[PDB]
């Protein structure tokens, strides 16, 4: 029963090519990410790249006591193994946990390995920059980043209002991090409330976690009093409550079994240029595959303490590549599943938040026309997808004999089951996502500002009345294995 | 030095997962194809399928002295190993051979392994159907097929005119095969000239060949006296003339080192229904991945002899999947290369006749914009492609940082470097190909007859003025090997 990051590493070590360690010295600045680019970053990272093992770097230059984990979630198959289901059903299996969550519980400090070591920022010798190897993903980044920081925080006026969300933070100084907070999201609203009263907002950043927690926390959750409800998904996935502990230096909870916890406060009335120390003009690589722009005005966590386990692992990601595809893509798929299946039961066979869109921009919907009235519902399923997940950009529709996880087979449906002046429907001027660099006025006369897009539905389903002409060549069913057993061993 | 199929097999056996044998009894009717569907048919074949080893079945039900080879050209990497070049350069490499062909030569029967065993149709016990296995691809095919028949044929009046072509053939009786010949092709014009005079056309069907010969025979060649010029490509690929032997029962040449040669004559004033023995309504699977209809009026080869090597291999294909992509796709790529490079030298970086289009329907063009004036040449390249290969359907244009052999990366360009109402150009009413089942009046109000199409250009290149915003996140160059030697040691 997996309850923390090390229980997960143990499971991976029982399967081939899921976990890999190296003792060869690596520089956290640029080099480590450059290495994993080849081994397992995947997704929208520039070629060459591939799906591979999660990888542990034991020998980090300048950090003789540290080790860095990347790629834990950077494969769909791997995520399936870590949660005990089939990779094609991963979105549905987690969607079931979302529906029957198990609440987290509070434990005492004696039960929290994340507090086996406490480094108070009090200490004159404290220096976040030398305590933690925060990797730099590319040389043009704004600085070192932590990329899997699970932030816990509460409303400053109503303490029963909580939030759990993944963030990335740039290291800005001996005890400072900058942190981008999405407008409108709960923790930013918390921070705006505290700042309007001139007060800091206490927060914990929890890194190195059971992958069920990271995966579960990307889904929308209900809000109950003191609920930290995102944690309920992982509670359901393991059938064991996620354990919280009180912070040592701030009045906010932290993840009891996390590897590293950064406790601090968002400062009132303070802001920094994200790239103030490099003037690179960039932040770090974004899920579409491009380096984003540096944010000119960011809030700052003032660090009051770092607590960690003995031999703490620092967990982050590279790419963000396939690791982002998994964390973002399963929620994208679940919400599309839920919307289509409630409106058109039995129609959708599956949906894939394609890695080529980082799990957000590109939806592949596999439908089955069962009867004459299903003609015209394939467009309806596309409208449902675009309405339910507004950061989507394009939809590709295929039938149930097309493998939506096989990009060759998607392009095959786009070649023999599509006519350009019939099957392609453009929907201009719909808000999409600012990190798509083609969503700009300069790219298109129908785009009125950044993050607005034309959204395109590629209908590659066979028209109902023509289906008799579109049967794929029927090869006979045979068990191939007796013909070459040793060859099918390689699985 | 590779000079026959067996030398090619021995080369394959020096590389991992390129060649596989099985002694498990197999039914050449349907079951064999059913097995290789899972092991390595690839291409447009229904999932599951994949690229895998070429496969030899040694244990053939009803044919205890036979063994059957499939999948020899069913892998771009395998074709590259076989011709001694890099997969990404394959078409450039065969294109060089097309330009400087090495003419074939005639050798005596003593230098002709293909006549080690002679089976005259003279013999009352001769029966084409029990002598050779002719696999069926699906249970609904017209009948047993030979799918890699290299035909040699000459003009019945002017013997200096020759032709060398690949055909498929259905086994129609004791000593008859049906053979479709493409209208206007040289061998068909030889046939019509002979039929118009009331005379048979002598011919040899050569099977089990140096892959160089099959690959080279799919390119257009010039005509010179007694040239058999398609063999000049294989000659240049091997820097050794292909060897011809005089047939034993008909006045026409055969491939000296072929595994199997069927000698016969196309009969005048005789036609058969392709599926006359099954009434299946179908021929066999076509390269777009659907079953073809049965041709109701095919000419007949009356067999006069079958010669073969000792321990002869019957070589054919399954799917036809990836084996067709290689055979058809390299000529498609070479012709696009030649046209674009002549018109816009330096602009095309590479082209991929994508396997999802069977090597014919879908072109991925990789261009590099070097200067402002290249803005607008990407579409020019697309037109060049559409002009020179009229069976193309759609073009996808990408820049030099997109891996065109990686369908995930194509879709990525389709997602972040494309706006539907800007980047997509439809060209309606252009003759395409009849075996694309969506090219019918029933699919589209703009299609006036079967085999006419809308042809779509998807411009997924970065507009020149915007290039600085579209740089893929620049992970540092690092040699990953030292960090994980034994992992990279699985190459």
Numbering used by the authors:
A (entry chain E), B (entry chain D): 4 to 494
What sentences appear in the manuscript?
Based on a literature survey and a preliminary activity screen of heterologously expressed potential para‐carboxylases, 3,4‐dihydroxybenzoic acid decarboxylases from Enterobacter cloacae (EcAroY) and Klebsiella pneumoniae (KpAroY, 89 % identical) were selected for further studies.2d, 13 Both enzymes belong to the UbiD family and are related to a ferulic acid decarboxylase (Fdc1), which has been shown to facilitate the (de)carboxylation of cinnamic acids in the presence of a recently discovered prenylated flavin (prFMN) cofactor. The AroY monomer consists of an N‐terminal prFMN‐binding domain (residues 1–339), an oligomerization domain (residues 340–475), and a C‐terminal α‐helix (residues 476–495). A comparison with the previously reported structures of the fungal Fdc1 and E. coli UbiD14 shows that AroY structures adopt an “open” conformation, where the position of the prFMN domain is more akin to that observed for UbiD, compared to the more closed conformation observed for Fdc1. Crystal structures and in vitro reconstitution data unambiguously demonstrate that prFMN is employed as a cofactor, and that oxidative maturation is required for activity.
A comparison of the KpAroY and EcAroY crystal structures revealed only small differences, in accordance with the similar activities observed in solution experiments. A putative domain motion might allow the UbiD/AroY enzymes to adopt a more Fdc1‐like conformation, but this has not been directly observed.
